[PDB]
Protein backbone atom coordinates (compact mmCIF):
# COMPACT_ATOMS: atom_id res chain seq x y z
CA UNK A 1 0.00 0.00 0.00
CA UNK A 2 2.70 2.59 0.78
CA UNK A 3 5.56 3.74 -1.45
CA UNK A 4 9.21 2.90 -0.84
CA UNK A 5 10.92 5.94 0.75
CA UNK A 6 14.18 6.61 -1.10
CA UNK A 7 15.25 9.83 0.57
CA UNK A 8 13.62 12.24 3.02
CA UNK A 9 15.12 15.69 3.06
CA UNK A 10 15.17 17.78 6.23
CA UNK A 11 12.33 20.17 6.93
CA UNK A 12 12.90 23.67 5.54
CA UNK A 13 11.12 26.00 7.97
CA UNK A 14 10.57 29.60 6.85
CA UNK A 15 8.15 32.10 8.38
CA UNK A 16 4.90 30.12 8.42
CA UNK A 17 5.40 27.57 5.62
CA UNK A 18 7.21 24.26 6.20
CA UNK A 19 8.59 22.02 3.47
CA UNK A 20 9.70 18.43 3.06
CA UNK A 21 10.88 16.75 -0.10
CA UNK A 22 10.73 13.01 -0.54
CA UNK A 23 12.02 10.71 -3.24
CA UNK A 24 9.63 7.76 -3.49
CA UNK A 25 9.56 4.56 -5.50
CA UNK A 26 6.26 3.22 -6.78
CA UNK A 27 6.62 -0.49 -6.08
CA UNK A 28 5.25 -2.78 -8.86
CA UNK A 29 4.02 -5.12 -6.12
CA UNK A 30 1.58 -2.65 -4.55
CA UNK A 31 -2.02 -3.85 -4.31
CA UNK A 32 -2.85 -0.78 -6.40
CA UNK A 33 -1.49 -2.66 -9.40
CA UNK A 34 -2.73 -6.20 -8.81
CA UNK A 35 -3.88 -7.88 -12.02
CA UNK A 36 -7.02 -9.07 -10.21
CA UNK A 37 -8.18 -5.48 -9.89
CA UNK A 38 -7.01 -3.64 -13.01
CA UNK A 39 -5.48 -4.26 -16.42
CA UNK A 40 -4.34 -0.65 -16.91
CA UNK A 41 -2.32 -0.12 -13.76
CA UNK A 42 -1.66 3.43 -12.62
CA UNK A 43 -1.52 5.09 -9.21
CA UNK A 44 -5.13 6.21 -8.51
CA UNK A 45 -6.05 9.50 -6.88
CA UNK A 46 -6.97 7.94 -3.55
CA UNK A 47 -3.46 6.57 -3.18
CA UNK A 48 -1.87 9.83 -4.24
CA UNK A 49 -3.93 11.72 -1.66
CA UNK A 50 -3.36 9.08 1.02
CA UNK A 51 0.42 9.22 0.65
CA UNK A 52 0.25 13.02 0.73
CA UNK A 53 -1.74 12.89 3.96
CA UNK A 54 0.49 10.31 5.69
CA UNK A 55 3.69 12.31 5.12
CA UNK A 56 2.09 15.70 5.68
CA UNK A 57 0.77 14.82 9.15
CA UNK A 58 3.72 12.80 10.40
CA UNK A 59 6.31 15.39 9.36
CA UNK A 60 4.68 18.83 9.09
CA UNK A 61 1.25 19.08 10.74
CA UNK A 62 1.34 16.48 13.50
CA UNK A 63 -1.84 17.64 15.20
CA UNK A 64 -3.92 18.09 12.05
CA UNK A 65 -6.10 16.07 9.68
CA UNK A 66 -7.91 16.24 6.38
CA UNK A 67 -10.90 18.58 6.00
CA UNK A 68 -11.24 19.02 2.23
CA UNK A 69 -9.62 19.09 -1.20
CA UNK A 70 -9.51 22.69 -2.39
CA UNK A 71 -8.21 21.53 -5.77
CA UNK A 72 -6.40 18.58 -7.34
CA UNK A 73 -4.98 18.22 -10.83
CA UNK A 74 -3.74 15.02 -12.45
CA UNK A 75 -1.47 15.83 -15.39
CA UNK A 76 0.45 12.61 -15.90
CA UNK A 77 -0.35 9.03 -14.88
CA UNK A 78 2.07 7.35 -12.48
CA UNK A 79 2.99 3.83 -13.60
CA UNK A 80 4.34 0.92 -11.53
CA UNK A 81 8.11 1.11 -11.00
CA UNK A 82 8.46 4.91 -11.32
CA UNK A 83 10.60 7.17 -9.15
CA UNK A 84 8.84 10.24 -7.77
CA UNK A 85 9.73 13.50 -6.10
CA UNK A 86 7.08 14.62 -3.60
CA UNK A 87 7.12 18.21 -2.37
CA UNK A 88 4.85 19.19 0.55
CA UNK A 89 4.43 22.82 1.70
CA UNK A 90 2.36 23.62 4.79
CA UNK A 91 1.12 27.08 5.74
CA UNK A 92 -0.42 26.71 9.21
CA UNK A 93 -1.73 30.24 8.84
CA UNK A 94 -4.10 29.68 5.92
CA UNK A 95 -4.27 26.05 7.06
CA UNK A 96 -3.37 25.04 3.49
CA UNK A 97 -1.24 22.09 2.46
CA UNK A 98 0.22 22.27 -1.02
CA UNK A 99 1.65 19.17 -2.68
CA UNK A 100 3.38 18.27 -5.91
CA UNK A 101 4.32 14.94 -7.51
CA UNK A 102 6.89 14.71 -10.28
CA UNK A 103 8.21 11.71 -12.23
CA UNK A 104 11.99 11.44 -12.65
CA UNK A 105 13.13 9.65 -15.83
CA UNK A 106 16.47 10.21 -17.53
CA UNK A 107 17.24 13.92 -17.18
CA UNK A 108 13.57 14.88 -17.23
CA UNK A 109 11.15 15.71 -14.42
CA UNK A 110 7.46 16.06 -15.34
CA UNK A 111 4.73 17.12 -12.92
CA UNK A 112 2.30 14.23 -12.45
CA UNK A 113 -0.18 15.83 -10.10
CA UNK A 114 -0.48 18.75 -7.69
CA UNK A 115 -3.08 20.31 -5.48
CA UNK A 116 -4.16 22.22 -2.39
CA UNK A 117 -5.78 20.60 0.61
CA UNK A 118 -7.39 22.24 3.64
CA UNK A 119 -6.61 20.69 7.04
CA UNK A 120 -8.18 21.21 10.48
CA UNK A 121 -6.98 20.88 14.09
CA UNK A 122 -7.57 17.38 15.52
CA UNK A 123 -10.47 17.45 17.98
CA UNK A 124 -10.44 21.24 17.47
CA UNK B 1 -8.85 4.53 4.78
CA UNK B 2 -9.91 1.89 7.32
CA UNK B 3 -13.51 0.91 8.07
CA UNK B 4 -15.29 1.76 11.31
CA UNK B 5 -14.98 -1.38 13.48
CA UNK B 6 -18.36 -2.07 15.11
CA UNK B 7 -17.91 -5.47 16.74
CA UNK B 8 -15.00 -7.90 16.98
CA UNK B 9 -16.04 -11.37 18.14
CA UNK B 10 -13.47 -13.67 19.75
CA UNK B 11 -11.15 -15.96 17.84
CA UNK B 12 -12.73 -19.37 17.22
CA UNK B 13 -10.05 -22.08 17.09
CA UNK B 14 -10.57 -25.62 15.80
CA UNK B 15 -8.13 -28.28 14.50
CA UNK B 16 -5.96 -26.13 12.22
CA UNK B 17 -8.11 -23.07 11.57
CA UNK B 18 -8.56 -19.68 13.23
CA UNK B 19 -11.76 -17.74 12.60
CA UNK B 20 -12.66 -14.16 13.40
CA UNK B 21 -15.89 -12.33 12.64
CA UNK B 22 -16.21 -8.54 12.45
CA UNK B 23 -19.01 -6.12 11.85
CA UNK B 24 -17.67 -3.09 9.97
CA UNK B 25 -19.20 0.19 8.86
CA UNK B 26 -18.19 1.64 5.52
CA UNK B 27 -17.82 5.30 6.40
CA UNK B 28 -19.02 7.68 3.63
CA UNK B 29 -16.07 9.94 4.42
CA UNK B 30 -13.44 7.44 3.26
CA UNK B 31 -11.02 8.74 0.62
CA UNK B 32 -12.19 5.79 -1.47
CA UNK B 33 -15.38 7.72 -2.13
CA UNK B 34 -14.11 11.29 -2.55
CA UNK B 35 -16.10 13.10 -5.22
CA UNK B 36 -12.86 14.28 -6.82
CA UNK B 37 -11.92 10.71 -7.67
CA UNK B 38 -15.28 9.24 -8.71
CA UNK B 39 -18.96 9.87 -9.31
CA UNK B 40 -20.05 6.26 -8.81
CA UNK B 41 -18.66 5.56 -5.34
CA UNK B 42 -18.00 1.91 -4.42
CA UNK B 43 -15.49 0.01 -2.27
CA UNK B 44 -12.78 -1.17 -4.66
CA UNK B 45 -11.00 -4.50 -4.46
CA UNK B 46 -7.72 -3.03 -3.28
CA UNK B 47 -9.63 -1.71 -0.31
CA UNK B 48 -11.47 -4.98 0.28
CA UNK B 49 -8.12 -6.80 0.09
CA UNK B 50 -6.25 -4.24 2.17
CA UNK B 51 -8.81 -4.60 4.98
CA UNK B 52 -8.74 -8.40 4.75
CA UNK B 53 -4.94 -8.41 5.12
CA UNK B 54 -4.92 -5.88 7.99
CA UNK B 55 -7.26 -7.82 10.29
CA UNK B 56 -5.87 -11.20 9.29
CA UNK B 57 -2.26 -10.42 10.16
CA UNK B 58 -3.13 -8.53 13.35
CA UNK B 59 -5.64 -11.06 14.66
CA UNK B 60 -4.79 -14.42 13.13
CA UNK B 61 -1.41 -14.66 11.38
CA UNK B 62 0.77 -12.14 13.18
CA UNK B 63 4.03 -13.29 11.63
CA UNK B 64 2.74 -13.62 8.07
CA UNK B 65 2.20 -11.52 4.95
CA UNK B 66 0.65 -11.58 1.51
CA UNK B 67 2.11 -13.86 -1.16
CA UNK B 68 -0.71 -14.19 -3.70
CA UNK B 69 -4.42 -14.16 -4.48
CA UNK B 70 -5.49 -17.74 -5.22
CA UNK B 71 -8.97 -16.50 -6.15
CA UNK B 72 -11.27 -13.53 -5.56
CA UNK B 73 -14.90 -13.08 -6.53
CA UNK B 74 -16.90 -9.85 -6.41
CA UNK B 75 -20.63 -10.61 -6.39
CA UNK B 76 -22.13 -7.40 -5.06
CA UNK B 77 -20.77 -3.85 -5.00
CA UNK B 78 -20.30 -2.27 -1.57
CA UNK B 79 -21.71 1.26 -1.39
CA UNK B 80 -20.80 4.09 1.00
CA UNK B 81 -22.62 3.82 4.34
CA UNK B 82 -23.17 0.04 4.30
CA UNK B 83 -22.76 -2.31 7.25
CA UNK B 84 -20.64 -5.39 6.58
CA UNK B 85 -19.90 -8.71 8.22
CA UNK B 86 -16.31 -9.86 7.57
CA UNK B 87 -15.41 -13.49 8.23
CA UNK B 88 -11.71 -14.51 8.13
CA UNK B 89 -10.61 -18.18 8.39
CA UNK B 90 -6.91 -19.04 8.57
CA UNK B 91 -5.46 -22.51 8.04
CA UNK B 92 -1.75 -22.21 8.90
CA UNK B 93 -1.31 -25.73 7.52
CA UNK B 94 -2.20 -25.05 3.91
CA UNK B 95 -1.15 -21.45 4.56
CA UNK B 96 -4.53 -20.35 3.16
CA UNK B 97 -6.59 -17.40 4.32
CA UNK B 98 -10.24 -17.49 3.40
CA UNK B 99 -12.37 -14.35 3.64
CA UNK B 100 -15.99 -13.39 3.11
CA UNK B 101 -17.78 -10.02 2.99
CA UNK B 102 -21.54 -9.75 3.39
CA UNK B 103 -23.84 -6.72 3.37
CA UNK B 104 -26.44 -6.47 6.15
CA UNK B 105 -29.65 -4.62 5.20
CA UNK B 106 -33.02 -5.19 6.81
CA UNK B 107 -33.27 -8.91 7.54
CA UNK B 108 -31.11 -9.82 4.56
CA UNK B 109 -27.43 -10.70 4.29
CA UNK B 110 -25.96 -10.96 0.78
CA UNK B 111 -22.40 -12.05 0.00
CA UNK B 112 -20.51 -9.15 -1.57
CA UNK B 113 -17.16 -10.78 -2.16
CA UNK B 114 -15.08 -13.75 -1.05
CA UNK B 115 -11.79 -15.37 -1.86
CA UNK B 116 -8.71 -17.35 -0.92
CA UNK B 117 -5.32 -15.79 -0.35
CA UNK B 118 -1.95 -17.49 0.11
CA UNK B 119 0.33 -16.04 2.82
CA UNK B 120 4.01 -16.63 3.62
CA UNK B 121 6.16 -16.57 6.79
CA UNK B 122 7.71 -13.11 7.19
CA UNK B 123 11.49 -13.17 6.86
CA UNK B 124 11.31 -16.93 6.25
CA UNK C 1 -21.97 -1.93 -26.42
CA UNK C 2 -25.74 -1.31 -26.45
CA UNK C 3 -28.38 -2.90 -24.24
CA UNK C 4 -30.85 -5.44 -25.57
CA UNK C 5 -34.14 -3.58 -26.21
CA UNK C 6 -36.89 -5.67 -24.62
CA UNK C 7 -39.85 -3.34 -25.08
CA UNK C 8 -40.26 0.22 -26.39
CA UNK C 9 -43.49 1.90 -25.42
CA UNK C 10 -45.11 4.55 -27.63
CA UNK C 11 -44.22 8.20 -27.18
CA UNK C 12 -46.53 10.00 -24.74
CA UNK C 13 -46.71 13.64 -25.89
CA UNK C 14 -48.32 16.09 -23.46
CA UNK C 15 -48.22 19.89 -23.43
CA UNK C 16 -44.45 20.49 -23.42
CA UNK C 17 -42.93 17.20 -22.25
CA UNK C 18 -42.42 14.25 -24.59
CA UNK C 19 -41.84 10.81 -23.03
CA UNK C 20 -40.85 7.22 -23.77
CA UNK C 21 -40.33 4.14 -21.64
CA UNK C 22 -37.99 1.30 -22.48
CA UNK C 23 -37.40 -2.05 -20.88
CA UNK C 24 -33.76 -3.05 -21.41
CA UNK C 25 -31.63 -6.10 -20.74
CA UNK C 26 -28.05 -5.58 -19.65
CA UNK C 27 -26.31 -8.38 -21.52
CA UNK C 28 -23.50 -10.19 -19.58
CA UNK C 29 -21.39 -10.22 -22.74
CA UNK C 30 -21.07 -6.44 -23.14
CA UNK C 31 -17.47 -5.19 -23.38
CA UNK C 32 -18.27 -3.16 -20.27
CA UNK C 33 -17.95 -6.39 -18.28
CA UNK C 34 -14.97 -8.01 -19.97
CA UNK C 35 -12.72 -9.75 -17.45
CA UNK C 36 -9.68 -8.17 -19.12
CA UNK C 37 -10.87 -4.75 -18.03
CA UNK C 38 -12.71 -5.02 -14.71
CA UNK C 39 -12.89 -7.53 -11.88
CA UNK C 40 -15.98 -5.93 -10.32
CA UNK C 41 -18.27 -5.61 -13.31
CA UNK C 42 -20.98 -2.96 -13.22
CA UNK C 43 -22.49 -0.57 -15.75
CA UNK C 44 -20.31 2.60 -15.56
CA UNK C 45 -21.63 6.14 -15.83
CA UNK C 46 -20.40 6.70 -19.36
CA UNK C 47 -22.43 3.77 -20.66
CA UNK C 48 -25.48 4.83 -18.69
CA UNK C 49 -25.22 8.31 -20.22
CA UNK C 50 -24.49 7.04 -23.72
CA UNK C 51 -27.60 4.85 -23.73
CA UNK C 52 -29.70 7.75 -22.42
CA UNK C 53 -28.34 9.96 -25.22
CA UNK C 54 -28.87 7.33 -27.94
CA UNK C 55 -32.54 6.72 -27.15
CA UNK C 56 -33.26 10.34 -26.27
CA UNK C 57 -32.12 11.73 -29.65
CA UNK C 58 -33.36 9.00 -31.96
CA UNK C 59 -36.83 9.06 -30.39
CA UNK C 60 -37.54 12.40 -28.68
CA UNK C 61 -35.12 15.14 -29.73
CA UNK C 62 -34.01 14.15 -33.21
CA UNK C 63 -32.30 17.43 -34.02
CA UNK C 64 -30.51 17.87 -30.69
CA UNK C 65 -27.31 16.80 -28.94
CA UNK C 66 -25.57 16.82 -25.59
CA UNK C 67 -24.46 20.14 -24.07
CA UNK C 68 -24.00 19.34 -20.38
CA UNK C 69 -24.94 17.26 -17.36
CA UNK C 70 -26.98 19.43 -15.00
CA UNK C 71 -26.98 16.64 -12.41
CA UNK C 72 -26.55 12.87 -12.20
CA UNK C 73 -27.08 10.56 -9.25
CA UNK C 74 -26.04 6.91 -9.00
CA UNK C 75 -28.00 5.17 -6.25
CA UNK C 76 -27.63 1.51 -7.13
CA UNK C 77 -25.03 -0.31 -9.24
CA UNK C 78 -26.30 -2.10 -12.34
CA UNK C 79 -24.88 -5.62 -12.64
CA UNK C 80 -24.52 -7.82 -15.74
CA UNK C 81 -27.74 -9.66 -16.61
CA UNK C 82 -30.18 -7.18 -15.02
CA UNK C 83 -33.47 -6.01 -16.49
CA UNK C 84 -33.98 -2.23 -16.49
CA UNK C 85 -36.78 0.24 -17.02
CA UNK C 86 -35.57 3.47 -18.64
CA UNK C 87 -37.82 6.52 -18.53
CA UNK C 88 -36.89 9.58 -20.64
CA UNK C 89 -38.80 12.89 -20.39
CA UNK C 90 -37.94 15.77 -22.73
CA UNK C 91 -39.05 19.36 -22.26
CA UNK C 92 -38.00 21.20 -25.44
CA UNK C 93 -38.94 24.44 -23.71
CA UNK C 94 -36.36 24.36 -20.91
CA UNK C 95 -34.26 22.19 -23.22
CA UNK C 96 -33.99 19.67 -20.36
CA UNK C 97 -33.88 15.91 -20.69
CA UNK C 98 -34.76 13.98 -17.56
CA UNK C 99 -33.93 10.28 -17.28
CA UNK C 100 -34.44 7.49 -14.78
CA UNK C 101 -33.08 3.93 -14.57
CA UNK C 102 -34.70 1.30 -12.37
CA UNK C 103 -33.81 -2.35 -11.77
CA UNK C 104 -36.64 -4.89 -11.92
CA UNK C 105 -36.17 -7.97 -9.71
CA UNK C 106 -38.99 -10.08 -8.32
CA UNK C 107 -41.79 -7.68 -7.44
CA UNK C 108 -39.39 -4.86 -6.64
CA UNK C 109 -38.24 -1.87 -8.67
CA UNK C 110 -35.35 0.19 -7.26
CA UNK C 111 -34.04 3.40 -8.82
CA UNK C 112 -30.46 2.84 -10.00
CA UNK C 113 -29.65 6.28 -11.33
CA UNK C 114 -31.38 9.45 -12.51
CA UNK C 115 -30.44 12.89 -13.71
CA UNK C 116 -31.03 15.99 -15.79
CA UNK C 117 -29.13 16.78 -18.96
CA UNK C 118 -29.14 19.98 -21.01
CA UNK C 119 -29.26 19.58 -24.81
CA UNK C 120 -28.69 22.08 -27.64
CA UNK C 121 -29.90 22.36 -31.25
CA UNK C 122 -27.58 20.70 -33.78
CA UNK C 123 -25.68 23.16 -35.97
CA UNK C 124 -27.66 25.80 -34.02
CA UNK D 1 -17.87 8.22 -28.01
CA UNK D 2 -15.86 7.77 -31.25
CA UNK D 3 -12.42 9.24 -31.89
CA UNK D 4 -11.86 12.01 -34.39
CA UNK D 5 -10.51 10.40 -37.59
CA UNK D 6 -7.59 12.45 -38.94
CA UNK D 7 -6.11 10.19 -41.62
CA UNK D 8 -7.12 6.83 -43.11
CA UNK D 9 -4.47 5.21 -45.29
CA UNK D 10 -5.37 2.59 -47.90
CA UNK D 11 -5.78 -1.10 -47.15
CA UNK D 12 -2.43 -2.88 -47.57
CA UNK D 13 -3.05 -6.45 -48.73
CA UNK D 14 -0.16 -8.92 -48.49
CA UNK D 15 -0.18 -12.70 -48.91
CA UNK D 16 -2.30 -13.81 -45.92
CA UNK D 17 -2.98 -10.54 -44.08
CA UNK D 18 -4.97 -7.34 -44.57
CA UNK D 19 -3.89 -3.99 -43.02
CA UNK D 20 -5.20 -0.47 -42.39
CA UNK D 21 -3.55 2.46 -40.59
CA UNK D 22 -5.38 5.39 -39.00
CA UNK D 23 -4.37 8.58 -37.27
CA UNK D 24 -6.92 9.37 -34.57
CA UNK D 25 -7.44 12.30 -32.23
CA UNK D 26 -8.74 11.65 -28.74
CA UNK D 27 -11.24 14.48 -28.36
CA UNK D 28 -11.28 15.96 -24.81
CA UNK D 29 -15.06 16.14 -25.03
CA UNK D 30 -15.66 12.38 -25.18
CA UNK D 31 -18.03 11.01 -22.53
CA UNK D 32 -15.12 8.81 -21.47
CA UNK D 33 -13.68 11.88 -19.78
CA UNK D 34 -16.73 13.60 -18.31
CA UNK D 35 -15.87 15.15 -14.95
CA UNK D 36 -18.94 13.53 -13.42
CA UNK D 37 -17.48 10.08 -14.00
CA UNK D 38 -13.79 10.61 -13.22
CA UNK D 39 -11.11 12.91 -11.87
CA UNK D 40 -8.21 11.18 -13.64
CA UNK D 41 -9.40 11.03 -17.25
CA UNK D 42 -7.91 8.24 -19.41
CA UNK D 43 -9.16 6.21 -22.38
CA UNK D 44 -10.27 2.92 -20.83
CA UNK D 45 -9.84 -0.53 -22.35
CA UNK D 46 -13.49 -0.83 -23.23
CA UNK D 47 -13.04 2.27 -25.36
CA UNK D 48 -9.75 1.11 -26.89
CA UNK D 49 -11.30 -2.27 -27.79
CA UNK D 50 -14.54 -0.76 -29.05
CA UNK D 51 -12.65 1.47 -31.51
CA UNK D 52 -10.46 -1.43 -32.64
CA UNK D 53 -13.57 -3.52 -33.36
CA UNK D 54 -15.35 -0.68 -35.18
CA UNK D 55 -12.65 0.11 -37.75
CA UNK D 56 -11.70 -3.53 -38.12
CA UNK D 57 -15.17 -4.73 -39.03
CA UNK D 58 -15.96 -1.80 -41.35
CA UNK D 59 -12.60 -1.74 -43.12
CA UNK D 60 -11.17 -5.25 -42.99
CA UNK D 61 -13.56 -7.98 -41.85
CA UNK D 62 -16.99 -6.74 -42.90
CA UNK D 63 -18.79 -10.02 -42.23
CA UNK D 64 -17.14 -10.77 -38.89
CA UNK D 65 -17.56 -9.98 -35.19
CA UNK D 66 -15.88 -10.33 -31.84
CA UNK D 67 -15.45 -13.80 -30.31
CA UNK D 68 -12.68 -13.31 -27.73
CA UNK D 69 -9.61 -11.42 -26.56
CA UNK D 70 -6.60 -13.70 -27.00
CA UNK D 71 -4.39 -11.11 -25.28
CA UNK D 72 -4.32 -7.39 -24.53
CA UNK D 73 -1.53 -5.29 -23.05
CA UNK D 74 -1.78 -1.71 -21.80
CA UNK D 75 1.67 -0.12 -21.65
CA UNK D 76 0.87 3.58 -21.59
CA UNK D 77 -2.28 5.45 -20.57
CA UNK D 78 -3.96 7.53 -23.27
CA UNK D 79 -4.88 11.02 -22.04
CA UNK D 80 -7.52 13.42 -23.39
CA UNK D 81 -6.27 15.43 -26.37
CA UNK D 82 -3.63 12.95 -27.59
CA UNK D 83 -2.95 12.01 -31.20
CA UNK D 84 -2.81 8.26 -31.89
CA UNK D 85 -1.69 5.96 -34.67
CA UNK D 86 -3.85 2.82 -34.87
CA UNK D 87 -2.56 -0.15 -36.85
CA UNK D 88 -4.95 -3.07 -37.57
CA UNK D 89 -3.75 -6.32 -39.21
CA UNK D 90 -6.27 -9.03 -40.11
CA UNK D 91 -5.38 -12.61 -40.99
CA UNK D 92 -8.65 -14.24 -42.13
CA UNK D 93 -6.81 -17.56 -42.13
CA UNK D 94 -6.07 -17.81 -38.42
CA UNK D 95 -9.08 -15.53 -37.89
CA UNK D 96 -6.82 -13.26 -35.81
CA UNK D 97 -6.99 -9.49 -35.62
CA UNK D 98 -3.88 -7.77 -34.37
CA UNK D 99 -3.99 -4.14 -33.25
CA UNK D 100 -1.56 -1.53 -32.01
CA UNK D 101 -2.04 1.95 -30.51
CA UNK D 102 0.79 4.45 -30.33
CA UNK D 103 0.91 8.01 -29.00
CA UNK D 104 2.55 10.67 -31.19
CA UNK D 105 4.18 13.55 -29.28
CA UNK D 106 7.06 15.63 -30.59
CA UNK D 107 9.32 13.29 -32.53
CA UNK D 108 8.44 10.33 -30.33
CA UNK D 109 6.00 7.46 -30.81
CA UNK D 110 5.37 5.19 -27.81
CA UNK D 111 3.21 2.07 -27.89
CA UNK D 112 0.17 2.58 -25.64
CA UNK D 113 -1.53 -0.77 -26.05
CA UNK D 114 -1.61 -3.77 -28.35
CA UNK D 115 -3.25 -7.15 -28.56
CA UNK D 116 -4.71 -10.06 -30.47
CA UNK D 117 -8.42 -10.66 -30.86
CA UNK D 118 -10.21 -13.70 -32.28
CA UNK D 119 -13.19 -12.99 -34.57
CA UNK D 120 -15.92 -15.28 -35.95
CA UNK D 121 -18.03 -15.32 -39.13
CA UNK D 122 -21.37 -13.61 -38.44
CA UNK D 123 -24.43 -15.84 -38.68
CA UNK D 124 -21.93 -18.65 -39.38
UniProtKB/TrEMBL annotation, chains A, B, C, D:
Domain of life: Bacteria
SUPFAM superfamilies cross-referenced by the UniProt entry: Thioesterase/thiol ester dehydrase-isomerase
Domain ApeI dehydratase-like: 14-115
One Pfam family this sequence matches: ApeI-like
Protein known as: ApeI dehydratase-like domain-containing protein
Native species: Pectobacterium atrosepticum (strain SCRI 1043 / ATCC BAA-672) (Erwinia carotovora subsp. atroseptica)
